């Protein structure tokens, strides 16, 4: 990337998101998942920033659509904490991690993550999103008591 990815990394992430949206709308995500895994594998070697988060979030969402384990991949990747997410992918990553932890017979750890997710959300006009996350938060807090 003399000038190929240094200016199109955000464009590449947006294109991947749009392709995933189209596939979820009127296609199948199996091939999209394979392509995303291949692209992520190609990344995380030349650089490990701004590209290892949106792809990982899309992969986690694709696995969440089905009923896979969804926890082996997340517990081995060291790029889940890129430390530079612009407060955008952190909310989705925390929501996915909290959902997995609550569905995995663990309740103590997920509270901090899901509170961070709710408190990292956009403040103005985010409607559908804080509904489900806050609903799950009150359900799991009832589980705690």
């Amino acid at each position: 990337s003399t000038q190929n990815r240094r200016a199109l990394d955000l464009v590449a992430a947006k294109c991947y998101y749009y392709h995933a949206r189209v596939y979820e709308f009127l296609d199948k995500l199996d091939v999209v998942r394979s392509f995303l895994h291949a692209r992520l594998r190609t990344a995380t070697l030349r650089h490990d920033a701004d590209g290892q988060a949106t792809l990982l979030n899309l992969l986690l969402r694709n696995y969440l659509h089905y009923s896979l384990y969804d926890q082996a991949e997340k517990l081995v990747s060291k790029s889940v904490f890129p430390e530079q997410a612009n407060n955008n992918e952190w909310a989705r990553y925390l929501y996915y991690t909290g959902r997995i932890k609550a569905i995995q017979l663990e309740y103590s750890e997920a509270r901090r993550t899901m509170t961070n997710a709710l408190r990292k959300a956009p403040q103005h006009t985010a409607v559908g999103f804080k509904q489900t996350v806050h609903k799950l938060l009150i359900v799991v807090e009832l589980l705690l008591g």
Partner: protein, 244 residues
């Protein structure tokens, strides 16, 4: 068409010369007919493995049957014995004192927990009763199973439950009558009460048992804090007066 299995399919194979047949079927497996027949053979092998108590073979057969049944391709929609195998696998993984994967495997079933399939209603009800202290329903339902024998796992659950009830009675009691243990633990008067008390030592006879508890170890000592609290105050001072 290269079946070689229509000979002793309906006829039982009580640990007879049939392992070679399974090996030959596996070699032959090495156009969904070849997969439908292989899945049926694997299901039959899994069903027959319970009567032999082959833990590794049962695990491998259960994994193969789950993989075959989880396919979303255009195949046979359902079978008449799949739910029985799923229930048997659930009972097996419950008998191993494993609960994480236990709960992960239920979510694969969309809504059949309470709608239909009493084959799944019985194990989930058993788990719900076992999670809290309600134990009478467990042994009551242990003599009531609509699916099949399931006797390979209910005995393990009975042993574990009896052991944990023995563990629990040891606490919070300093007096109890001898016949009360025979009432609580379902062995009535088989002479097993004295040997069982030999296993869990107990102290006295005269139709009575006693236990002793201290629990004052943590209190009445301030020396144990004296170091960790000093470390904590040192940490406060260290992160209070350093230039960052």
């Amino acid at each position: 068409m290269y079946e070689q299995l229509k000979g002793e399919w309906n006829r039982k194979s009580p640990n007879l010369s049939k392992c070679g047949e399974e090996l030959g079927r596996l070699k032959l497996v090495l156009t969904k007919q070849q997969l439908i027949l292989a899945r049926d053979i694997l299901e039959i092998g899994a069903q027959w493995s319970i009567l032999r108590k082959d833990i590794p073979s049962f695990e491998r057969y259960m994994a193969q049957l789950k993989c075959y049944y989880f396919d979303y391709k255009e195949q046979l929609p359902e079978s008449a014995y799949m739910h029985q195998l799923l229930g048997l696998n659930l009972l097996f993984l419950l008998s191993q004192n494993r609960v994480a994967e236990f709960h992960t495997e239920l979510e694969r079933l969309p809504a059949k927990d309470i709608q239909t399939n009493v084959y799944i209603k019985h194990p989930v009800s058993l788990e719900q009763y076992l999670m809290e202290g309600s134990y009478n329903k467990v042994f009551l339902a242990k003599g009531n199973i609509p699916a099949e024998s399931y006797t390979f796992f209910i005995d393990i659950l009975l042993d574990t439950i009896r052991d944990e009830i023995a563990g629990c009675i040891e606490k919070a009691y300093e007096k109890i009558l001898f016949t009360e243990a025979t009432r609580i633990l379902f062995f009535n008067t088989p002479k097993k009460m004295t040997d069982y008390a030999k296993k869990r030592g107990w102290v006295l006879g005269p139709n009575n048992y006693y236990s002793f508890a201290s629990q004052q170890q943590k209190p009445e000592d301030t020396t144990i804090p004296s170091t960790e609290l000093a470390k904590q105050v040192i940490e406060y001072a260290r992160q209070l007066e350093m230039i960052v």
